[PDB]
């Protein structure tokens, strides 16, 4: 997240870090005790046996006994298209059930087909790059963004920060976009580098996939 702020510790207890050999590379969202939702491109050709799913984290540079770590048992995809960057969504079934507590909770999703209007105010979040001013975040970051349709398309939720250069960045893919208390997006792709101030950030449109998600987690 470029130009955001530190989240309050455990403000977003559905937020997940996906890791390889102890290193964060993508976010995810806890959507049931034994399922997380992320971006499909995060696991494209990745050996998923190597992926650790880390719940309950805040500061990736500290020891945190709030964390719960899981492996991935099964992947459920929905037609990810890496040429057009469509359907950038995957569900990862965990090898057990999370212990739901103050620091680890299941997210609330929108109704199937729910659209967001221009000007909806949302929060983006993640542990991605802060810039090449700084590096990967240690502490979870959040960012106020606004939903836009100029230079968007109906197959994405797109967002912009008005009046300054700020946005999601590498390592934030897979992280939730929270709009009106619901997970409406999964961070997918930027255009023209991070935080251009010109091209809206693109999120997978979670409301389009609710029936699919429900078919798996129920």
């Amino acid at each position: 997240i470029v130009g955001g702020r530190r989240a309050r510790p455990h403000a977003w207890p559905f937020m997940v870090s996906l890791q390889l050999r102890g290193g964060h590379f993508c976010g995810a969202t806890l959507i049931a005790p034994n399922f997380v939702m992320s971006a499909a491109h995060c696991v494209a050709n990745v050996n998923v046996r190597a992926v650790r799913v880390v719940l309950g984290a805040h500061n990736l540079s500290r020891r945190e006994p709030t964390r719960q770590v899981f492996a991935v048992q099964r992947i459920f995809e929905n037609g990810y298209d890496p040429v057009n960057l469509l359907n950038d969504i995957v569900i990862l079934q965990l090898n057990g059930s999370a212990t739901i507590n103050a620091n680890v909770q299941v997210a609330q999703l929108p109704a199937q087909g729910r659209r967001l209007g221009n000007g909806v105010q949302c929060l983006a979040m993640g542990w991605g790059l802060l810039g090449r001013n700084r590096g990967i975040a240690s502490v979870l970051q959040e960012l106020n963004v606004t939903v836009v349709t100029s230079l968007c398309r109906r197959s994405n939720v797109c967002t912009l920060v008005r009046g300054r250069q700020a946005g999601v960045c590498f390592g934030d893919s897979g992280s939730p976009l929270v709009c009106n208390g619901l997970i409406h997006g999964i961070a997918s792709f930027v255009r023209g580098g991070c935080a251009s101030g010109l091209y809206p950030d693109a999120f997978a449109p979670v409301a389009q996939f609710v029936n699919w998600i429900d078919s798996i987690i129920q």
Binding site: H41, L85, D88, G128, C169, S173, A187, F189
Partner: peptide, 4 residues
């Protein structure tokens, strides 16, 4: 366009 750059995934992220």
């Amino acid at each position: 366009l750059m995934x992220x």
